[PDB]
């Protein structure tokens, strides 16, 4: 199967989101369950993103103020502004990291059911607003080629 892009359907994007969230929560010791080189590369890119982010800025969760009623709008506002003037792989990694932070904060704030919702919101946003761009810019394959090297 070398003729088409890796993870080229919404079903694959869903799997990518669920595995990402499981990883980000596992880094905190929180167990949760709802292309392999793709999952691996995204783990690495998000971790390296976070390292850099934290060198410059305070904890991402400091800015959130989650409640069950407002979490969806909070997510939508941030992600809309992130992509308002365009998409690139760096912004996509930022999107995954933001989603991860939202999930971690939900669990910290004893709102663990929100994790399942956030997973849904990320999957829908990916499929509605990023997937076209991903296919048009080389698939997850291009991401693996660009972000594969560990620096």
């Amino acid at each position: 199967g070398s003729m088409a892009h890796a993870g080229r359907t919404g079903y694959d994007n869903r799997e990518i989101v669920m595995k990402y969230i499981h990883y980000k929560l596992s880094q905190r010791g929180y167990e949760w369950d709802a292309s392999e080189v793709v999952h691996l590369t995204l783990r690495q890119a998000g971790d390296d993103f976070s390292r850099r982010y934290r060198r410059d800025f305070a904890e991402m969760s400091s800015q959130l103020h989650l409640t069950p009623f407002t979490a969806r709008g909070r997510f939508a506002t941030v992600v809309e502004e992130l992509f308002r003037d365009g998409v690139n792989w760096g912004r996509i990694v930022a999107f995954f990291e933001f989603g991860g932070v939202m999930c971690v904060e939900s669990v910290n704030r004893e709102m663990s059911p929100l994790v399942d919702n956030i997973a849904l919101w990320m999957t829908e946003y990916l499929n509605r607003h990023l997937h076209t761009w991903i296919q048009d810019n080389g698939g997850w394959d291009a991401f693996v080629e660009l972000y594969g090297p560990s620096m």
Binding site: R52, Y53, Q63, E81, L82, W89, R91, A94, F98, L146
Partner: peptide
């Protein structure tokens, strides 16, 4: 909020320029 998205965006943009 807006501040958060700007931080995510600029960090993202840096990371995508570095990949180039």
């Amino acid at each position: 909020m807006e501040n958060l998205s700007r931080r995510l965006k600029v960090t993202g943009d840096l990371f995508d320029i570095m990949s180039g």
